[PDB]
Amino acid sequence: TEALYQVGKEFTSKMDLEKPNYIVPDYMPVVYDKLPQPPSHREAIVNSCVFVHQTLHQANARLAKRGGRTMAITPRHYLDFINHYANLFHEKRSELEEQQMHLNVGLRKIKETVDQVEELRRDLRIKSQELEVKNAAANDKLKKEEYAVLISEAQAIKADLAAVEAKVNRSTALLKSLSAERERWEKTSETFKNQMSTIAGDCLLSAAFIAYAGYFDQQMRQNLFTTWSHHLQQANIQFRTDIARTEYLSNADERLRWQASSLPADDLCTENAIMLKRFNRYPLIIDPSGQATEFIMNEYKDRKITRTSFLDDAFRKNLESALRFGNPLLVQDVESYDPVLNPVLNREVRRTGGRVLITLGDQDIDLSPSFVIFLSTRDPTVEFPPDLCSRVTFVNFTVTRSSLQSQCLNEVLKAERPDVDEKRSDLLKLQGEFQLRLRQLEKSLLQALNEVKGRILDDDTIITTLENLKREAAEVTRKVEETDIVMQEVETVSQQYLPLSTACSSIYFTMESLKQIHFLYQYSLQFFLDIYHNVLYENPNLKGVTDHTQRLSIITKDLFQVAFNRVA
Amino acid sequence: EEYAVLISEAQAIKADLAAVEAKVNRSTALLKSLSAE
């Protein structure tokens, strides 16, 4: 515990971690017994880090006691945790500061514009008075070749007055349309201080989740996060309880691209994608279904990713080619791990004579900074030696109840209500595109208000762009509630099939748990999906039946029957 | 009151004519300076 505390304290010396108004709790959860009794904020942070490491130790002990499979928790896990903490803290602080600066610039620009329109109204009234006196003088003297010139000047200044009034009207309409953005930015700038207050605990929790919770399933990940949150609450360390882990560790653009990359729509899958993006050690993927390998292939397709295996005789040459040319590599069958990757996984690089050398066996190879490797396996039951567990970060692609229920609901909806399922897919695509468009428009509006030089009304291009952005935002929002109401009616239609999906999830998770009474009862998810497809499409009891509810009842009964018949 | 408007636009087109003449003079000076090239 002393060594972990010293490592954390030395590593986290670069981060701020300074909260002068920190209030020491009455019952401080002491983990390092030599921690000062009136601890600082930094000392409390490091104590929480050590506590996170110890909780991983205790979770592994609990899993081992229950007969489950555990992977060793090494000091490299702690190093990954503190590295992720530093990186996430710096990233979040920089993003928050930049966003606050942009919002302040926008609010100042809006206030300047309203002051400008006020002074422009004043100038308009000055202009009207001078025009009226000029016209009156011209008429009065014409009552009694040079006054034609000044009445032409009066007409020109009247055109100028009309232009000024048109600018006033256009600008005031624009500002009245910009009130919602102004108030939203005002609220966000006011809550900036609160967001800054709870950044250390949030980054600590996110880093711990990335570094540690990769191998465990949904229940144990939630238990670990709950334990860490309770400890931070006990230590009087502020963190946001409202924001989700996935939404905090990723943006909507990344999630949309991941969905485009055949990533399953699940919270656990999204967290696994986050780990696959923000990894410190090279990932070891455990996906029996094989979807994660396809996700990795699609994600790194533009970077020329190649697939090999440890059993392949071309593994060595493919590995050295990837190392030399900096190409992504995906190596399967990690249960046949080749120790030749040990210097690569440990990042034992030698920087001599302007060369970054990696020793691959007996030969030194110029390592390229863009090289990345992913180890994969389809067997969730493999046990790895502690060395390999230390050299990689585990990304376990387990099947969750929510994901299975959603998958079965989509499958039955497509099989029995194909029009409703097609409409559902189209609506999801349209909603994704619309939300992307709103995000892009909002960002472009901030950028346009930021990059403008001088005043908004000085150049009418800014006015035109702002009006176009507002009108496009309004129209896409209109499309948003339209697609939302039709999505709502689609959801009401599809809610009837929920009990069948729940039954399917329960049936599969009973199938997956038959292995506890006999080693021979090993069933994959593909077996249950084959059962489901047979019940849906190849059911002899659905020859002439067209009623939807009777078909659903037959489907449920035949699902139970076929599941038992095939498993038994 | 209406012929004032058209004499004003006549002086406006007078200004336009003066601008056209100035543009003509500057363009022809440029061309007579670009003869060698």
Swiss-Prot record, chain A:
Residues 249-478 are annotated as: AAA 5. Residues 91-144, 433-496 form a coiled coil. The modification N6-acetyllysine is found at residue 176. It comes from the Eukaryota. It is found in: Cytoplasm, Cytoskeleton. Belongs to the dynein heavy chain family. It is linked to Charcot-Marie-Tooth disease, axonal, type 2O: An axonal form of Charcot-Marie-Tooth disease, a disorder of the peripheral nervous system, characterized by progressive weakness and atrophy, initially of the peroneal muscles and later of the distal muscles of the arms. Charcot-Marie-Tooth disease is classified in two main groups on the basis of electrophysiologic properties and histopathology: primary peripheral demyelinating neuropathies (designated CMT1 when they are dominantly inherited) and primary peripheral axonal neuropathies (CMT2). Dynein heavy chains probably consist of an N-terminal stem (which binds cargo and interacts with other dynein components), and the head or motor domain. The motor contains six tandemly-linked AAA domains in the head, which form a ring. A stalk-like structure (formed by two of the coiled coil domains) protrudes between AAA 4 and AAA 5 and terminates in a microtubule-binding site. A seventh domain may also contribute to this ring; it is not clear whether the N-terminus or the C-terminus forms this extra domain. Homodimer. The cytoplasmic dynein 1 complex consists of two catalytic heavy chains (HCs) and a number of non-catalytic subunits presented by intermediate chains (ICs), light intermediate chains (LICs) and light chains (LCs); the composition seems to vary in respect to the IC, LIC and LC composition. The heavy chain homodimer serves as a scaffold for the probable homodimeric assembly of the respective non-catalytic subunits. The ICs and LICs bind directly to the HC dimer and dynein LCs assemble on the IC dimer. Interacts with DYNC1LI1; DYNC1LI1 and DYNC1LI2 bind mutually exclusive to DYNC1H1. Cytoplasmic dynein 1 acts as a motor for the intracellular retrograde motility of vesicles and organelles along microtubules. Dynein has ATPase activity; the force-producing power stroke is thought to occur on release of ADP. Plays a role in mitotic spindle assembly and metaphase plate congression. This is Cytoplasmic dynein 1 heavy chain 1. The gene is DYNC1H1.
Swiss-Prot record, chain B:
It comes from the Eukaryota. The modification N6-acetyllysine is found at residue 32. It is found in: Cytoplasm, Cytoskeleton. Cytoplasmic dynein 1 acts as a motor for the intracellular retrograde motility of vesicles and organelles along microtubules. Dynein has ATPase activity; the force-producing power stroke is thought to occur on release of ADP. Plays a role in mitotic spindle assembly and metaphase plate congression. Belongs to the dynein heavy chain family. Dynein heavy chains probably consist of an N-terminal stem (which binds cargo and interacts with other dynein components), and the head or motor domain. The motor contains six tandemly-linked AAA domains in the head, which form a ring. A stalk-like structure (formed by two of the coiled coil domains) protrudes between AAA 4 and AAA 5 and terminates in a microtubule-binding site. A seventh domain may also contribute to this ring; it is not clear whether the N-terminus or the C-terminus forms this extra domain. Homodimer. The cytoplasmic dynein 1 complex consists of two catalytic heavy chains (HCs) and a number of non-catalytic subunits presented by intermediate chains (ICs), light intermediate chains (LICs) and light chains (LCs); the composition seems to vary in respect to the IC, LIC and LC composition. The heavy chain homodimer serves as a scaffold for the probable homodimeric assembly of the respective non-catalytic subunits. The ICs and LICs bind directly to the HC dimer and dynein LCs assemble on the IC dimer. Interacts with DYNC1LI1; DYNC1LI1 and DYNC1LI2 bind mutually exclusive to DYNC1H1. It is linked to Charcot-Marie-Tooth disease, axonal, type 2O: An axonal form of Charcot-Marie-Tooth disease, a disorder of the peripheral nervous system, characterized by progressive weakness and atrophy, initially of the peroneal muscles and later of the distal muscles of the arms. Charcot-Marie-Tooth disease is classified in two main groups on the basis of electrophysiologic properties and histopathology: primary peripheral demyelinating neuropathies (designated CMT1 when they are dominantly inherited) and primary peripheral axonal neuropathies (CMT2). Cortical dysplasia, complex, with other brain malformations 13: An autosomal dominant disorder characterized by global developmental delay with impaired intellectual development. Some patients show signs of peripheral neuropathy, such as abnormal gait and hyporeflexia. CDCBM13 is associated with variable neuronal migration defects resulting in cortical malformations. This is Cytoplasmic dynein 1 heavy chain 1. It comes from Homo sapiens (Human). The chain holds residues 3449 to 3485 of 4646 of the full protein.
